Design a protein around this nucleic acid. Sequence first.
RNA 1: GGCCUGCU
RNA 2: AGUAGAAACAAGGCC
Lengths: 249, 735, 96, 716
Amino acid sequence: MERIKELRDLMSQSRTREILTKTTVDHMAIIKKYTSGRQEKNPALRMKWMMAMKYPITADKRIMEMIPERNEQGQTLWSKTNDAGSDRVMVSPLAVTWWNRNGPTTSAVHYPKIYKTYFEKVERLKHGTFGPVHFRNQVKIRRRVDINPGHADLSAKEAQDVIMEVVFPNEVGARILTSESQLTITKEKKEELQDCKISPLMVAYMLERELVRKTRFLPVAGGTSSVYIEVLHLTQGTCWEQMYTPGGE
Amino acid sequence: MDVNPTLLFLKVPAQNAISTTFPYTGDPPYSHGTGTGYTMDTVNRTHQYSEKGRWTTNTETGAPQLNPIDGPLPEDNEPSGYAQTDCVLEAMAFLEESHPGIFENSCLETMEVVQQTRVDKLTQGRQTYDWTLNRNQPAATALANTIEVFRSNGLTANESGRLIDFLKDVMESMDKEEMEITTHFKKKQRLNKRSYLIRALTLNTMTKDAERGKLKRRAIATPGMQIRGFVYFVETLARSICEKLEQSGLPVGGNEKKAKLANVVRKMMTNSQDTELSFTITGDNTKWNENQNPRMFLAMITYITRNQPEWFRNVLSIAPIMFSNKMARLGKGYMFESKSMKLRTQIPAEMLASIDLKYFNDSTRKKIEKIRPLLIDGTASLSPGMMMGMFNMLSTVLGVSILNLGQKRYTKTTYWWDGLQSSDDFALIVNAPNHEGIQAGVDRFYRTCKLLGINMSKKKSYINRTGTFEFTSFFYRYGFVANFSMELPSFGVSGINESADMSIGVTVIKNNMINNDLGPATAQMALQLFIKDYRYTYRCHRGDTQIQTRRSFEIKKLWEQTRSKAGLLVSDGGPNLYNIRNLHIPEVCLKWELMDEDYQGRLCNPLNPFVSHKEIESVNNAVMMPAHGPAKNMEYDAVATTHSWIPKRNRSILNTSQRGILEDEQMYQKCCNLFEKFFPSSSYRRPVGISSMVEAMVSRARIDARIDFESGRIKKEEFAEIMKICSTIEELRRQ
Amino acid sequence: QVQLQESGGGLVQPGGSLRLSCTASVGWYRQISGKERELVARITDYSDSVKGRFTITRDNTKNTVYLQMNSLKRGDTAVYYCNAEHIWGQGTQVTV
Amino acid sequence: MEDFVRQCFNPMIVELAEKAMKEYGEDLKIETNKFAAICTHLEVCFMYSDFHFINERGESIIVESGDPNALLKHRFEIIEGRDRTMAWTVVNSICNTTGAEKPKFLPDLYDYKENRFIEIGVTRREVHIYYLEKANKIKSEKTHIHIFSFTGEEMATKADYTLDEESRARIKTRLFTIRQEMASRGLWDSFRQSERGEETIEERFEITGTMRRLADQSLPPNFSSLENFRAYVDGFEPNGYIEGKLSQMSKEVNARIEPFLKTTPRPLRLPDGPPCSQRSKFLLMDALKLSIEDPSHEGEGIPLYDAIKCMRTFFGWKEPNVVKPHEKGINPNYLLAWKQVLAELQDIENEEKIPKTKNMKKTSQLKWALGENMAPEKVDFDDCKDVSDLKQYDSDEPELRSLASWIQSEFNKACELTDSSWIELDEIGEDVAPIEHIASMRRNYFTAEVSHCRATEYIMKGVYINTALLNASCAAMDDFQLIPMISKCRTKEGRRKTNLYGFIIKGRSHLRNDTDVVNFVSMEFSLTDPRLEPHKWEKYCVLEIGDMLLRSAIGQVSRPMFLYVRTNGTSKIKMKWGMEMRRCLLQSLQQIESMIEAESSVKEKDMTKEFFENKSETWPIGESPKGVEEGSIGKVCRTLLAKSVFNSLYASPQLEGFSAESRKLLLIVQALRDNLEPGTFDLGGLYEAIEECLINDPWVLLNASWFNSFLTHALR
RNA sequence: GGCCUGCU
RNA sequence: AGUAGAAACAAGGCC
């Protein structure tokens, strides 16, 4: 109901009507990236400079109807002045902390299921067992190794269709996945995330990260396993070796 | 006793303590005003290194151009751009012979990419010179403006959605009698053929800031949008070629560079017997970009693309053809001050052609006098050579050809050489039975380099025995030695957001521990200092302290409200649980089991009004410009929390005549959000097609209302309401 | 903490030479009548007025700082004080 | 033939078919019979779908015209007439909502009763072959297929015909209308067989027009056209052309190697001129501290109250008077500013609660001291052209200045220990791995070594001052603000303490660019008399403000106590980089830990404890008149920390240039000392490159002097 | 005096 | 004045 209604409201005004009519689907990306905002050259300097202002961050308009304009002593939490090239409003950082102490609460039980990679890292480290540190010269030789320890033996494009069919089943188009490994992955990640309401985009991004294999060139000495490379900073050094066995093994 | 750190080198070798010689703890030099002086100096220097060439006047642009190719051979060691066509063609032929099938294959993959590439690939670029407004703007904005102007003028082949078609339209625009542009102060202005040619062939010049390692400032250039597609295709070909060359090091990272350097030094020295001596030259090329003539790149590519479809050759040749006629905008201008009357003034650079020379000092006066003959419509012709490393990969190809030309099969002498080339820098390992052989080999290498328009900087170069050398701030001494002073500037808060900054800092510490041999105790100290600076920057202190800030009240009440205070994030005033073992874990997941369910739910709430995600590309990618290197992007692990807000924008557009761009931004974003709600996959996979917005949106409204009734909330009343509302918007689009 | 004892002052002719010493148990300063106290030499660093004419040396073994003054002029007439890092000597007269 | 589609069919269908024509990219002028055939297919699709509605039952309600109501459901909903992307969108949506099977090709319609697809195709040939043809094109299909053909016959599997027969009579009447209208036209010479499935195209990228002429002007000097040059390149083969030009090229083009021996390198020449002055934003060696001995932590507390309490701890105030003038400014303004600061400090002391941040009055005194309303007004060139004085901004090499001995002593005392701990580090996760324990022990050793160091005190001073200045500039852009210099330490006894060096008055700070300058005036207490090294205080104005009595065995000194007052300035970049001075600790201690690890790779054991306690090994860390002096590892730590701190304090382009061009020569000298037969092509050029960076910065000149001393001691 | 902006 | 260094800041524009 609503969606077509703001569609009609947009088409009511002449300029947006022209934008909707003359613009083709292919140009979607271009106009979406059409912005006057330059990409910052020195982010640290301005982050240290903007945070000294009042209302340094930006938030959706809806914040004006969930968080009061001021806190107990009267420190303002949000302003009604919109951003430069968006309908979002500039708000103070307190509106963040406020949201974490009296804002609406939900059931975050499914975030562990979504962010599978990070929670698997935590579980692997929690059950790890350290050993003695041995001091001897390490011959670090540079090798190509896979960093992602949960890659399902799929490439970027190869798993992209799987991700769409898992999250966006209707926009798949011609592709119907042939490999049965992809079939089982789709089934599992479909039944597992059937009602998760985090965001389609973040779900797709994390599925891409988990399933897609990624490789990088690093100086290693021993190890060479996927689980042993994520902790390469902790097990191998310039003149010391720290024996380690992740919780998985 | 007087303390002197440098004397420490009397016991510790120079490379084992080279980090002490990198003052990367202070503010790097910045330029303050116009870069016009540097632009003029660079143009004059590029034109006078090729003075002995031949002059001509282009019949289309009417600008004077200098061709030094096949000019007189140099008779001195000064820089020279007199490259010889036959010599470079022979070098490329030998490169092909030593690597058969390189050019044909690379051309095949490049042909595939060119004929399947899309227009949107041009949006994935940093600032570009929009000619519609004569100023630098984001790549997407400039592309959109140029497409709009083309469509208004009648060039609508780009509607096919293909980059090749966009380039076809671009070339067709060159043969138009009169184009029309828009200006706000809206006014429609008409550009004749020559003016549009110069506007499409021109470059915008700026001054490079945050450049560490030299006393003087330099100038850099940014091209337009008409020529970036050809550049993209040419660089794709050059990258595909260099990926097949082990002597190149430009298309790889740092660790790969070190590995290849070690391999080449071991190969050269180990194969050398006791009788052969080995010497390493740590060479830098003086005026690398100013001495590389685009015509020679045209020759190299047309030799590479031999026995290929003529359309491929034409599309790959268009780029150097435009660079050979490239023009450069002088710059921002010049600012004058009058102390007697106590005032200041800012004259644009376009007045340099006619403005009197009484206001300029002797140096600038002479520079303007020398560059005036080349001024055409406020921009100077820069045919002789490249401006700033636009063809990095082709230059690397030429250098690799030079390196391979001494494989002992072409030297025809006992001496021989090899090494690694990365544009403007090289390491050359030369072996010969005696010092005379080494001298002859280096002399012939230098002479051959001078025949290709490449000069070796004698002041910044030195030769020693193999085993010790330098390459791009990587010091090799019987094995590469860590520096850690190049990455020091990256140890602070990045400046993206709270969660992003935390993750980026911990990940940078981890990486520099893995690669740059950062010590454990040093890493712990870095973690402590980073946490201190992070808390002091975001006004998020431990919460149990009495440090009054603008955010210390809400943080303190959250602290007193929470029961398990060990689960609070550092952003919310909680303890830091990070350590050397936890540097690869996001903060949210490390504290997940310690958080109270109420605070956990409030933090990671999808309905939060702070989190905003635009595209799959910008989810967890942060662009950090590294010190002493080109802009780079990093993947940082982070959980989407309420702290993932995006900061405020500039907001200074409101005082400029270009104020309508914000309204267009808002309307485009509203339409894009509506489309995304209609097409959820709009962000992850960019939609493709040739239909218009409202058609897809209305038709999908039809179908989705239908099916969501066939099972879902909709009802006949609502379904029919949607159907007739779709009809209403249909008849509205009719009129 | 340190005590400073000067020696070798007195009366000398134009163009002459004189040798001051300071025993510490570091530099030389001078004050002319009606003028401020100026640095002569420290240990090396030297005032422009005395460069190539006066030479300061230091023996760490015996904590002693000799000042050799050659090519003396009427403008070098002053009370000369030893200093150690600030501790000052009593001052020794030099009259050219 | 196109005249037929001009005449008969309605607009809607003709433009739908025209967009379907554009879909796959073939042109309509070459073969139009496909257009007519597929538009008739689309027409039968409509006429079969429309006029057919359903209500809550099955048994479709058929109405010749849809009446106004909610009962406008369509019996058959069309697939084709849409783009491929949307056709597959509808296919997938139907499959996911109907739970049916996804076909591999494009259907034409969907129906509810039987909950499935219809692929309508009316071909010229008879049905009973085309049916099974398209059937074997589609794999294992449950979608029912139904086709007509011009003769008037119908067929289908299951003997199934899904709706009314009068509609099918309609279809075949339409069909024979088509047929015996072409009868009047006469198209069957090709109508039965006009499409055979042609798909081919050649990509054409032709250079022509102006862009061709440009190609003719981008060739070597003796070429006339791109065609000729490409022909020459294709016909070119290597025939020893590099050798000919190498032989013909003049022999003066050479890269002769000049041997580098012990006697080759000469000392770097230093510039001569007036002595070098002080550039720091605060006093480093001559600072004085007024303290309270409070238990508050670094950030804990309120600045103004702490400053006032510290200042009340000192007795002996005198009416201030000029001691050493600025020599270029108006010292009475500085005097009046100091008295104004004191008066307003008392004014705060009187009132109820000390404000967290105070704003000062904008008197003419600080208007001059902060440089207000001095920027020339910006105007247009067309209005100021006849002014003779109008010229460029002064752009020349900075003034030349010779090195002085004060920077050496300042660095010497910047590496000395202190009676306080100036670093209070944060918390870290409890160490769980033995390597973490080793790291923590190492870190504790270095903290014990460097905390009691003047370099750490300077780090904290700079960080706090720059943080406060940046925050005040960003918050109080317009109005002058008072900020007391505060630094909190911990005594040997363990009691925490605060220290007040002085005050900073920040002025207008409307900073837009990263290079825009915010001016402030800094006042700092000290005891060092400025009458002994005046050249070091060229830009300072120093007053006499009181007398101090520190307990000494020589009765009690009762020393004078002066106020160094000056006008200084910074910028956003400088403030940001000065507030990250803590990474000097990193740099230094990373270097020391690299030393320790490198040495411990030799002996298979951690070597930190004996390095820090036994102090047997020592490194050359300075030269005394007797000779080179070596110190323990802790002294090396402090020396490197001081070097990094001074790099961060006296940063400048000169420093970067000298560092690079002297690291080059240092590497060459190291190669010489390693017996690696180093050689150079132009050493004079390198020397000139190094010597052009030394202009007036005290730090870079001191570094150059150190480099000369290192060369003198090396090369032996 | 009143209001706008701080990488456009 | 001051910062800074091959050109700039020491507020800008709009009424």
